[PDB]
Amino acid sequence: SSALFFGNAFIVSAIPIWLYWRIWHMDLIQSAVLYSVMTLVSTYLVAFAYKNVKFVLKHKVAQKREDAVSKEVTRKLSEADNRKMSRKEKDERILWKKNEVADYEATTFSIFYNNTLFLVLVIVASFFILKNFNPTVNYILSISASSGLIALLSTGSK
Amino acid sequence: SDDSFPPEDFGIVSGMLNVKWDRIAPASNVSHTVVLRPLKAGYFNFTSATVTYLAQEDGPVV
User: Fold this and answer.
1) CA-to-CA distance for A140 and A138, rounded, in angstroms?
2) CA of A30, closest CA in chain B: separation in Å?
3) Relative orientation angle of helices A89-128 and A135-155, to the nearest 10 degrees
């Protein structure tokens, strides 16, 4: 799970580089290091944001899965095995599997929410703020601001 | 004459275009379809296109 989270964070932080790869194509032999370092720092910040958001939303997700918990209760109990089962282990196993699926769905939702928020302000920034500043500096600052806001929306400790 | 053209984003067909025609006739013209061949995607500027006339009546460049 840690490895897949690592890879997902890196790929979602690198896909902006994927769309910025051939769109301008300025000195790749020298801009590759800049792209790598920005991707790494964005990956770290977005991973911190993902951890914070999943931790804060797990409280709601606990009761969000209650209907599915009861649905699995129905099947785990509607059997002659449940007539002479442990009568408690069933609850433990269904809680474990529902927690696992809840964590998976919550992480997916958070990752894609941050990804969707990533490509909202960057386009308008590159379209407008280039009037007075260098386009490359504008793209760099837009990416930095997007990463910072993605990190800050997690905790929100204003 | 293609004096004021962006060399980085647009390339001229016949190098530095310097076309002399000296003809006023419905028969034909040498070339008025300048094919600027771009190299890569980006921001392109339509700077200008130099069109001068060495009027045989006077002689100095217009």
Assistant:
1) 5
2) 19
3) 150
